[model samples]
Target: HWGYGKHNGPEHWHKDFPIAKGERQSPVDIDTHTAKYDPSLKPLSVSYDQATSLRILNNGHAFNVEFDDSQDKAVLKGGPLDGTYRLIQFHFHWGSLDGQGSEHTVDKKKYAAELHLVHWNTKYGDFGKAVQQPDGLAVLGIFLKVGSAKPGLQKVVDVLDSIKTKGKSADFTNFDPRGLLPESLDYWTYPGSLTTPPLLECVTWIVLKEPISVSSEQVLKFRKLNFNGEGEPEELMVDNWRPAQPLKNRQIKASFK
Candidate 1:
């Protein structure tokens, strides 16, 4: 199976998933100097309903909080998008240590962790159909820095113990993901792929410039989770982030000066 280990890690991914080397691969370094300010880029509008949160599960790769997308109860609009994008789920990528983890970086600087809010284009029906189109998905990436405790994050951390192994899951209702967002919505937009396997090049990435805070203690709780299942050898779920890929010919557009 694909994993973050030396044997099945990112370097060996191209052997099975050829799109790993594609031109528009994700998690590219965001060079502020090269990013162009686009006044035409409208401010992002995110509307979410607390009641839509269904559950949280450990999919071996990362922990994901799933949402109910049966209707337009939760969605992302404007800012590098054509229409409403339904909120399907949100997950995080983190490192074994505090110094590095985030998939996308700023001028080569790494953050403690990264949060990805995955959305699907409503025009394409559902996430299954949307994944095949060029404008199928819109992912909002928020960097997480180590600092004072954040109550917004504690709710998630409190549930980690219930899903300490792969395939484990629990009901996670009434959780509003908006509480985890940074105060400023300033972001850099680019066309890219999913950072994980199958690495489909169908995402419009909106990476915020501002980072939210999480205490080091809380991050340790995430590390307590395992990549391996209950019967297998124990393996901590740290360093779950994919490294930054090449920028190629893609341009990074900024919503701020």
Candidate 2:
């Protein structure tokens, strides 16, 4: 059980998952000043089918909105990808307070929360197989700041009460994830790994430059979730974000100048 507690948090993850310290681990602090603007980089194209959204579940680490990825119904293509990547699921990482919850930072600045839209390369058979390949996954990361309420996000927040504890799930259909995106599709691209343990170095991180807004009240609802299961002692889920890892030899490429 690699929970975000002091005993088993990000700092202690390397003992169990050696790749946690691998060369291209994710959530690297993006130094906008040094990030090269690649003129060759194309704008990202994302097409999400509303009917593909199946359910939302509390998977202990974070609440995930799972999608039906058996087909390429919801897909992400163009920018930084060789082929189509099917949307498998999406999740969030947040902090107890508004100042520092995001996994990735911009010039050492953290956001209130971060949203990850997980997609697997269609060239690979499935997510299980894709997770093993170097260029098998493309995760779109969007930062969330405290401001006006997002109508799209409110739909998700409304169901937090039903999925208060780990392993709880409810039907969540016809949800269009695109509604949660910012107006700008500009982003920084780099090769990285999963932010969580078993930290496989298989992800191509596409972190957006612009952030979407979420009310302070909406963020508080996320904290009310429990990392512990129903019978287990109440452990509120907060500060579930991993700190920024080393940049190493990787060069972050920006889509915008």
Candidate 3:
């Protein structure tokens, strides 16, 4: 019942749901014309691991980085860091508890899926230790549709058998996480809370508008992820995204320049 139907939308989500503020209600509209207030910053170069690749771990969450050397290597340029940020892990969000997915919704337009690039402040230490500090994390979000048809992610779909069962782990040979990134590095940004919990006022959000696409069949594979607990493994997380909230007093800046 977690959806935008009758009583499922943000209007009544708090009544019985115990989800985080970020998860329950968030990702408000980013008014491109709003006044700018972020510091002029530069992104660091990301390095991909040519040795072993992204090992998908079953973290109860659909797809989590079980092991990735690239995540740490592309960290903000400094010595572990105040100015630079390092990708800690990467995952996805979708709607089709079975397939339809997305993170941010603009005037109710939800894409097929959204990719989350989780990074931690070098100044705060590694991701495991960052949670302790107030400003420890930042995420670069990229929206994905089923149109790119790039076949880059095809390499991953072929390996689903490796982790077919829930809570399973396996060796996903020759997989590269870097290839998953969208073509246009351009993005939209703002300082917001995590779309999960603690709803900290820290994260520097970067969301892209240009969406990438995959095959329809590939999206269907995402629907297999179960959302139900130990009682029923039948309920899927077809549409796990929370609807967009009010802009409130926040301003969302565009990086089209």
Better of 2 and 3 by lDDT: 2
**Candidate 3 local lDDT, 1-257, one digit each (tens):** 44444555545555554433442135666554563533454543445453244577544446665434343555433211256666666777777632346767544566788888777777665665665554566676777777545476777666655555447666765656677777775566665666554345456667766777777777777666564444455556456565566556556655455
**104: Cα error in model 3, Å:** 1.1
For model 1, how does the per-residue alpha-carbon lDDT over 90-185 read when each residue is reduced to its tens digit?
999999999998999999999999999999999998899998988999999999999988788999999999999999999999998878888899
Give the CA lDDT, 0 to 100, for residue 249 in model 1. 90
Taking all chains together, each candidate's TM-score versus the true structure is 0.99, 0.98, 0.76
What Cα-based lDDT does every candidate model obtain? 0.94, 0.94, 0.59
- The predictions' CA RMSDs to the true structure, in order, are 0.8, 0.8, 4.7
lDDT of 2 at 120: 96
- How many clashes would you count in candidate 2? 0
Lowest lDDT sum, 10 consecutive residues, model 1, at 42-51
